[PDB]
Ligand binder design. Sequence first.
Ligand code: ADP
Ligand code: ADP
Ligand code: ALF
Ligand code: ALF
Ligand code: ALF
Ligand code: MG
Ligand code: MG
Lengths: 448, 448, 314, 157
Amino acid sequence: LKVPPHSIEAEQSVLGGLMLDNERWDDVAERVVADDFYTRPHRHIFTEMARLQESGSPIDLITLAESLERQGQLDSVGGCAYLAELSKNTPSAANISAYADIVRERAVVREMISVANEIAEAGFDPQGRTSEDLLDLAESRVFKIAESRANKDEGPKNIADVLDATVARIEQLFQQPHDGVTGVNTGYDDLNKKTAGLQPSDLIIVAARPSMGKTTFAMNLVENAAMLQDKPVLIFSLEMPSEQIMMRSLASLSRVDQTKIRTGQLDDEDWARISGTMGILLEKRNIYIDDSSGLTPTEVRSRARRIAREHGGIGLIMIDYLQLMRVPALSDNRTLEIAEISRSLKALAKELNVPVVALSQLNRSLEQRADKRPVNSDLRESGSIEQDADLIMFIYRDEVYHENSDLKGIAEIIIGKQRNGPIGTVRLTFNGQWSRFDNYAGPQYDDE
Amino acid sequence: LKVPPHSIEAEQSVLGGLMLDNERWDDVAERVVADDFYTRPHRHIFTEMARLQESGSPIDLITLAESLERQGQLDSVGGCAYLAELSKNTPSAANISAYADIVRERAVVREMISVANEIAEAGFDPQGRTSEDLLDLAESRVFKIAESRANKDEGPKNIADVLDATVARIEQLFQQPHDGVTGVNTGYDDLNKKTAGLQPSDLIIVAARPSMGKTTFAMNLVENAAMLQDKPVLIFSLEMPSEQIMMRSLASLSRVDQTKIRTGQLDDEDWARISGTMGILLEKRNIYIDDSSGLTPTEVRSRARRIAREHGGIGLIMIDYLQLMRVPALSDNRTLEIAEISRSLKALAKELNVPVVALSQLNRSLEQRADKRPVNSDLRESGSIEQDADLIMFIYRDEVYHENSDLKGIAEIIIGKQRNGPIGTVRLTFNGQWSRFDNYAGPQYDDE
Amino acid sequence: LDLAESRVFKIAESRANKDEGPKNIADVLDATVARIEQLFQQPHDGVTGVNTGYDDLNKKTAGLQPSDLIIVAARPSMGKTTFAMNLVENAAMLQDKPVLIFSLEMPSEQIMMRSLASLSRVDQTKIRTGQLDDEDWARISGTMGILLEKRNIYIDDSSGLTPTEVRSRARRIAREHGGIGLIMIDYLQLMRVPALSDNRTLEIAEISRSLKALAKELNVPVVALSQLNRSLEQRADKRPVNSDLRESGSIEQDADLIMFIYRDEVYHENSDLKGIAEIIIGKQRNGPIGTVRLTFNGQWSRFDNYAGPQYDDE
Amino acid sequence: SPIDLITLAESLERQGQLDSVGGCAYLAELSKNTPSAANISAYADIVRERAVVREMISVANEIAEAGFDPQGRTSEDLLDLAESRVFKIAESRANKDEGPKNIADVLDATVARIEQLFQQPHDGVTGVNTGYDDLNKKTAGLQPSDLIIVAARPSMG
DNA sequence: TTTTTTTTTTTTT
Ligand SMILES: Nc1ncnc2c1ncn2[C@@H]1O[C@H](COP(=O)(O)OP(=O)(O)O)[C@@H](O)[C@H]1O
Ligand SMILES: Nc1ncnc2c1ncn2[C@@H]1O[C@H](COP(=O)(O)OP(=O)(O)O)[C@@H](O)[C@H]1O
Ligand code: ALF
Ligand code: ALF
Ligand code: ALF
Ligand SMILES: [Mg+2]
Ligand SMILES: [Mg+2]
């Protein structure tokens, strides 16, 4: 006698919370309905609660008991004793939303079980229905379950939208071409335009071959975010110690030769710039760095939670880098370890609702191709990283692979994957002297 | 005990008929497999019969009995007496197809029952899995049954039926006058004469050197097709943004300077022409644009299928251009990538029964020859493009190479390939200022 | 050990050589003499294989021999499929056994229209456009009647056909009609082998080997088409040779007959050989190589025997 | 999700693990017996101490068993195994340090270190001199803690 | 279950 899956405790908690806190009815109304309660008395009680709320009466023990007695259904549920027990057994109504979600889970699972039972009954007795008929019946039954998935738009915009956009742009060419920055500012006009800033809850993967300025680009983004927001930002520099990272940051901010900074060959003017940068940084105090080695995802999550709770959230998270993270449980298979790391980081980003720039590295096969511009598959263990990543940005430098290149000092940031925006190339001016990236002010090349 | 549905008599009839006629094995083979039989002895017997058939030996009572005995399976299946009973109980093999289909039906019904039971059990015990995991499991399981029963092959076709279909289609064509243009009207007299319009299922290729107006002629053709049909058209502009494509389309339709539209220098007359074109398009709403780059053939196929299903077919598809599509699986081999892209697009055209005009780029070695008129070998990454293409049109502008050209303002569309027609040249008047191609009304040059 | 080895030798190879294995020269000579006396008993015109329907081609090949692989190659637009369908039609009309066509390249409709244009000697453009007069309709009706009388041609336009599927269908047709007179494949590179999909060359080699094995098994000619490489067009002389095949290596090594289609008119607009197509037999196991001239009526999409002056083969 | 009696109990029941942990009665006992979570850090540290002690005992027992039964392994192999086992436990405790605690101290320390490096008037080479003027200029010598890889085809020197 | 290595055969430039 396999009892249908259910949760007496969850239903009791929801009912008690409704008896205690009426204000959270709406949060419960959207999640669950009367039918979702496995036990019929709970269905009756929720129906009466809905009727009282619709009439505007408050939901409490006395009013609910009176209303149920007036309907003669009070005996069917258990009277003042049972309703008082329902109100009593709830630890707190603050978690009524979670109980409602669990009840919805149970209701959906029971619906799936009933659908399976109906399909099995149809299979046992086709009643002259063809195999095609039974398959279509099963598919129709299952599609009811997948109503909460949808597909949204896949790209095809009709002629009317094209005309509207064309007219708007032709008119705004005379006007000011604003960007529309909503996310965390990237500090660069074109990148902000194509990305609308670093979207919260979205996983961003910056990839490049080593020595391409991957860490440099990430640090520049983090510094720009810190100077353009008050919320703290977080960095996990497993690859390098905090000292080198801070030296890079100071060299970029002060626009001074990082070689001088490292060597200590600093003049009075450069020293004054460094002092000003130090003052600005110690004024902000919105940057946090961890020089830990071999961090596991759980440690990163716990530390991020600590910092967010202490400072009421985090503006940005940075990880340097994915392939350094360790999962001793999945050490046997590297690919599974990487996939689990990526999934955990994505879940962390969603839970904290903060942009997360986690760095990644490419397989050598990229350099075997005639064109060395990276693509999505070039990621090492691209199987899972590409799937989990919401935004993927590749860093390329033609000057690196061609000393006679005409694009000297130019770095290409190619958005190769973007769920909520367009892919494409962007150009930036790379000053290796300061290890910095700047908005590209050169002639615009057509994106062909 | 709800026994799974089965038909033992059908199985025995099939086995006896096979024992009585080897020639009807294939009919049974295409309909059922060994695992389909409800009883394991029948599965073993069918497997042994298949093994005998692969060896070419005649399938009979004694041969089957010996084969099973050599595997120690004789007494397991009931001995020689059971096989003799099976052979005796079957009068004839005439209705063997019906019995095989019955066995297939019972096996698939049992499969459906098993899948439903599995889904129900998983719903009962998620084992910590989220709901969506179970829902996707159910969807995949149902899809497996749906795809398993797939006799998706028309098989060998006698010439009589093909002749009848061809004659019916030819008579249908002869019925409705179309001025010789069977496919969607191109809007150009000589091109229609040489091609009878872009026929259904074709993958048309248009190629040209840079700055030759490669996209311009294709856009003019798409405009002519859309204005001359009720079916929708879809344009994959992997090359240029939708804005520029729409601006070029408006310039061609209204014959307004492209520079003015790009710069916004629109006067009352030009603005009125543009407004009329906008009204015409908003009345039509038969044009769809997708500017996403790096698209796989899979994405193009899915997006074309969406339009076909929503709007009851497609009139034309346009792709700008082939060399921008990406196949991640074969990325490291560009030639394999191009072959896959070309073959997949040809299959898409055939499946949708709609012309697919996809553009391509040429090689520089063309410029080194005495005659700059392009041929098939001049294509870049050429191996598969010609071999898959149906109608290949090369755009040639001597004015670009010779400012002393006697054919200024004239562009030659050379038919480098036409499976169902002759080859030759079509001269057209090219208005670069308006970005349009028009029928050439000047002196006629007889082809050599 | 020597005794045990000898004892096992008395079993394994002793039994293997009887039914199979190395055939002693006596049986081979007996079979050869039987075949020779079979030819002796049957007076023929010299075209032992299925008649190609063309004078010089039949002379140089003596008809399409059983069990042999024939590879008709050309650049696209050179009428490879046209010539192949002409050969299929001639074989069907000159024999009673059925023929089977695998038109992976094109749908059955286009191939059938081409065949009707060739047989009725009617313009392809008119048939495609439906601009047919009464005489053309009468010719097409007569051809339809002839074909519906013959009932000896079968077509399959299924895409992604593997060699195993082709073999199964060929066996099915042979059992249905007691064998096959000819098989036509259009074309090789469109066949699929998922096992060797990683290496294209290995896939092509396996396809070629499987088709040759199929031809040997069914004792029927199998004409499979292929496509060349563009390096051919980079040479001064554009006449195709063996090296010009795409995925070349295995194909020639498996082929018994190789015919390259050349059209000087295609590459030379001022060609003096307009309307003349050169079928170059570049490989022939049991005969001489050389060039043959044919008249190509692209309007009717047909190949006919060249009735013009014969040029000495240098 | 919130960690509470009801949600935890149902989560375990979803994996059939509730009755394995003593059930709802045991969970209620656990919830009741704890007065408050103020001293939770001390309890976690105590649990960590006990777990590490058990780990040390297990490693010692394994080493003793291997010594009793080398199974043909030489002494060096057993000593290296013991070395690795002890080093693993030693490294497993590096969880209190190396974290992104309040940045202000870290920034001050890093800036102070940078100032210290500046004050030391080196001749351009702050690390192990490579002995070559241009290489030292481009690299400032072989820096401490840094991994340097010199590569070339064989026979290149 | 993956990264390497490095044969071999092809295509393409
Ligand atoms: N003094 C300098 N002058 C010019 N370029 C420099 C200087 N210092 C560092 N760089 C550049 O900064 C880049 C940073 O390299 P690295 O951080 O290892 O790359 P990634 O973080 O992308 O793996 C190097 O590729 C180097 O060219
Ligand atoms: N109406 C016509 N007039 C003249 N020639 C034609 C006509 N229709 C087709 N052709 C010729 O028939 C040939 C068939 O091409 P195709 O079958 O693609 O060659 P292949 O099969 O060798 O690749 C074309 O090269 C074309 O020149
Ligand atoms: F070499 Al790096 F981030 F500096 F991959
Ligand atoms: F173009 Al083809 F056979 F018709 F190669
Ligand atoms: F690789 Al060597 F001497 F270091 F041959
Ligand atoms: Mg770095
Ligand atoms: Mg062809």
